[PDB]
Amino acid sequence: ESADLRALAKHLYDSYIKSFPLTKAKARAILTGKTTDKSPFVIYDMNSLMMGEDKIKEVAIRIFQGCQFRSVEAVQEITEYAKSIPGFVNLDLNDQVTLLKYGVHEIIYTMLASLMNKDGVLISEGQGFMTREFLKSLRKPFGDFMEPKFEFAVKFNALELDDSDLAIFIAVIILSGDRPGLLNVKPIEDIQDNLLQALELQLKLNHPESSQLFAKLLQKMTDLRQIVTEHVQLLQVIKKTETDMSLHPLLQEIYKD
Numbered sequence: 023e024s025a026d027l028r029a030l031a032k033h034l035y036d037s038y039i040k041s042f043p044l045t046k047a048k049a050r051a052i053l054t055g056k057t058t059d060k061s062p063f064v065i066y067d068m069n070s071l072m073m074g075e076d077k078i079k080e081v082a083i084r085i086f087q088g089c090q091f092r093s094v095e096a097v098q099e100i101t102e103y104a105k106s107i108p109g110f111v112n113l114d115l116n117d118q119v120t121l122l123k124y125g126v127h128e129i130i131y132t133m134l135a136s137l138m139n140k141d142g143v144l145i146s147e148g149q150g151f152m153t154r155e156f157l158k159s160l161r162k163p164f165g166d167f168m169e170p171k172f173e174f175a176v177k178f179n180a181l182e183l184d185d186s187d188l189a190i191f192i193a194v195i196i197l198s199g200d201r202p203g204l205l206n207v208k209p210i211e212d213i214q215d216n217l218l219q220a221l222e223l224q225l226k227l228n229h230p231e232s233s234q235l236f237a238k239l240l241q242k243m244t245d246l247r248q249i250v251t252e253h254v255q256l257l258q259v260i261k262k263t264e265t266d267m268s269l270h271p272l273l274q275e276i277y278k279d
């Protein structure tokens with residue numbers, strides 16, 4: 023029954039809005055100009071960065087640390103969202119942990135695209151905008167940190183998905199039965215099956231003229247895997263070049279594959 027799938031799509035979108043304070047709908051309103059009361063302050067260099075802190079220790083390190091906090095906060099939002107996916111909290115606790123461990127960064131980059139355009143990324147709940155060029159000019163090895171995320175976003179954003187679409191896609195990512203170390207794959211696959219059915223119907227109804235959007239979206243999951251791997255390799259470099267900088271415990275536990 024497509025009625026049961028629509029109900030599921032609704033539930034997930036409702037939960038998504040309740041779990042993520044900054045939606046794509048709001049991110050785009052800020053970025054496009056449906057503003058006057060939502061205009062962000064733009065950081066494109068040092069002085070503007072200094073000016074930014076006023077109404078929003080080398081530069082690179084500070085920016086990376088703030089980035090760590092936001093990532094940790096995002097893990098929290100995603101964990102809260104995960105609990106609303108029917109069947110998730112009823113799985114073996116060890117598996118719930120494994121799914122989150124491997125799913126959170128793929129979700130972080132998927133949603134990060136909502137805050138990006140080819141010129142930069144929204145920061146601090148949308149109050150600021152840091153240009154891609156500025157980030158690209160940070161000393162090594164931080165200058166190459168975000169570039170791959172922007173490249174992904176530019177392409178991913180071309181799919182023109184909205185929050186109701188993303189809510190289901192994110193649920194699909196979390197319930198991946200192929201994650202390393204899963205104890206009971208079957209119950210997870212059965213849940214993903216239902217989620218895949220919901221995503222398929224949603225895309226057909228929400229994007230009637232977008233042929234094979236469903237398949238094109240699932241293929242993006244390959245891009246997300248890639249991004250994580252490179253990111254991990256870059257993190258390895260930072261660990262060794264900055265021995266005076268500390269990586270957040272939660273994040274360390276996540277990468278401790």
Ligand SMILES: CCCCC/C=C\C=C\[C@@H](O)CCCCCCCC(=O)O
Nearest residue numbers: 042043044088092130133134145146147
């Ligand atoms: C140093 C960067 C500061 C970024 C803060 C900007 C937006 C954060 C908003 C969150 O609270 C709730 C929004 C839902 C999470 C999805 C945002 C995209 C992502 O960060 O993965």
Ligand SMILES: CCCCC/C=C\C=C\[C@@H](O)CCCCCCCC(=O)O
Nearest residue numbers: 085086089090092093134143164167168
């Ligand atoms: C050093 C470059 C910092 C650029 C920060 C600009 C936008 C960031 C938005 C955040 O929500 C998402 C950033 C996640 C990147 C990785 C964070 C660390 C990690 O979780 O591994």
